[PDB]
Design a protein around this ligand. Structure first.
Ligand SMILES: [Ca+2]
Ligand SMILES: [Ca+2]
Ligand SMILES: [Ca+2]
Ligand SMILES: [Ca+2]
Ligand SMILES: [Ca+2]
Length: 421
């Protein structure tokens, strides 16, 4: 939720006055990069003038600065205001509290307010070394901390025990719960890189997992994945994809994994929307056979909001929509890849919702799918996924997880789900 009007903010307004010392006002601001986004306080230098006052907190939306509304200004416009303030001069800030954090706006797992990594690390060490292992404590803590906070905990635990927290939990847990907890301990890039590597172990590859990650990750997420993957496995993710895929499926996976999709433009390009739509039609349903490189080119290179509009304009040319056209035109890993991709373009929360439903709908569970989605999306769009799940399937994601899993494994997934609907 974003608004550039102070009369539509429904939080608490706090007026504060600060003097810029020798090391700035003493705080870090975040947000204000994507068009409709707020500007919230990230951290406070505890020896700086901002933390000194004590009226300013993390998550506060900066409504105005020096009698000028900065609601809806970019990140560089309000940074230039505070930097132009000389040393010793005064700034006036009206803040608004009641809003999450922007980045994790639709996540289910939020940063724990009274976070203390040392206390969490000790409590986790005590749980591990309790006779019989206190899994409930390990679950209650790690699933109610952000990933960032889980990195501080693992650092404090290594500071205290001289052993890595992941090694310790490995020897204390087992089965599906172990998979969940170790997944949560990795950073997003680390987790995705290791799922990618596991989908390529042995001669046979797990095409479904490779497709799920490569089709759903953004440019930014794919950039960091490529970096951490070579760091961890001493090889480029692209090379490993070339090794374990072939044909047109290889072309599509290599192109998507580059994370070089064009960024969402400023202007809507209506002529290109219609021309792209025309080109997708001519390349497939209009003709015998399929010009797959043309599909690959358009669907991996245009921005997501552009492709959403070409898929709607595509319905003007073809009697089948994009999903139906994919099933009619193509087969195999290639068909699956195209279907997962345009679902991700059209409605990504619904994509994950359907993938979650499919993992639980029948006999047993596809736990690798359920676990990976619960872990990887819990700080991204889990609230939207739950909304789409409930709208489409009539019962909550929570309800299905509760039916399909049991034990501490279930409780860990329910915490990642974040409540019922
Ligand atoms: Ca136990
Ligand atoms: Ca083990
Ligand atoms: Ca393989
Ligand atoms: Ca055909
Ligand atoms: Ca089931």
């Amino acid at each position: 939720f974003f608004t550039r009007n102070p009369s539509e903010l429904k939080g608490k307004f706090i007026h504060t006055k600060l003097r810029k010392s020798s090391r700035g006002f003493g705080f870090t601001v975040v947000g204000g990069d994507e068009p409709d986004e707020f500007l919230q306080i990230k951290s406070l230098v505890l020896d700086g003038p901002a933390a000194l006052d004590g009226k300013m907190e993390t998550g506060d939306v900066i409504v105005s600065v020096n009698d000028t509304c900065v609601l809806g200004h970019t990140h560089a416009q309000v940074v230039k205001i505070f930097q132009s303030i000389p040393i010793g001069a005064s700034v006036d800030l009206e803040l608004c509290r009641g809003y999450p954090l922007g980045s994790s706006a639709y996540g289910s797992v939020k940063a724990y307010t009274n976070f203390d990594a040392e206390r969490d690390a000790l409590n986790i060490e005590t749980a591990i070394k309790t006779k019989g292992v206190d899994e409930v404590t390990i679950v209650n803590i790690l699933t109610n901390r952000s990933n960032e906070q889980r990195q501080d905990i693992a650092f404090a635990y290594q500071r205290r025990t001289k052993k890595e927290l992941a090694s310790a939990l490995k020897s204390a847990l087992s089965g599906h719960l172990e998979t969940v907890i170790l997944g949560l301990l990795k950073t997003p890039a680390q987790y995705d890189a290791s799922e990618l590597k596991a989908s390529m172990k042995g001669l046979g590859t797990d095409e479904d997992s490779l497709i799920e990650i490569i089709c759903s990750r953004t440019n930014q997420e794919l950039q960091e994945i490529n970096r951490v993957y070579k760091e961890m496995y001493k090889t480029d993710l692209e090379k490993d994809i070339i090794s374990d895929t072939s044909g047109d499926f290889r072309k599509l996976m290599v192109a998507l994994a580059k994370g070089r999709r064009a960024e969402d433009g400023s202007v809507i390009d209506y002529e290109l929307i219609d021309q792209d739509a025309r080109d997708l039609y001519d390349a497939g349903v209009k003709r015998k056979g399929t010009d797959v490189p043309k599909w690959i080119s358009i669907m991996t290179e245009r921005s997501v909001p552009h492709l959403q509009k070409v898929f709607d304009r595509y319905k003007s040319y073809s009697p089948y929509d994009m999903l139906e056209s994919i099933r009619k035109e193509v087969k195999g890993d290639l068909e699956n890849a195209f279907l997962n991709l345009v679902q991700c373009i059209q409605n990504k929360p619904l994509y994950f919702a359907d993938r979650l439903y499919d993992s639980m709908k029948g006999k047993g569970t596809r736990d690798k799918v359920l676990i990976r989605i619960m872990v990887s999306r819990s700080e991204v769009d889990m609230l939207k996924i739950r909304s789409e799940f409930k709208r489409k399937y009539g019962k909550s994601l929570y309800y299905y997880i509760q039916q399909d899993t049991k034990g501490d494994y279930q409780k860990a997934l329910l915490y990642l789900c974040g409540g019922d609907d």
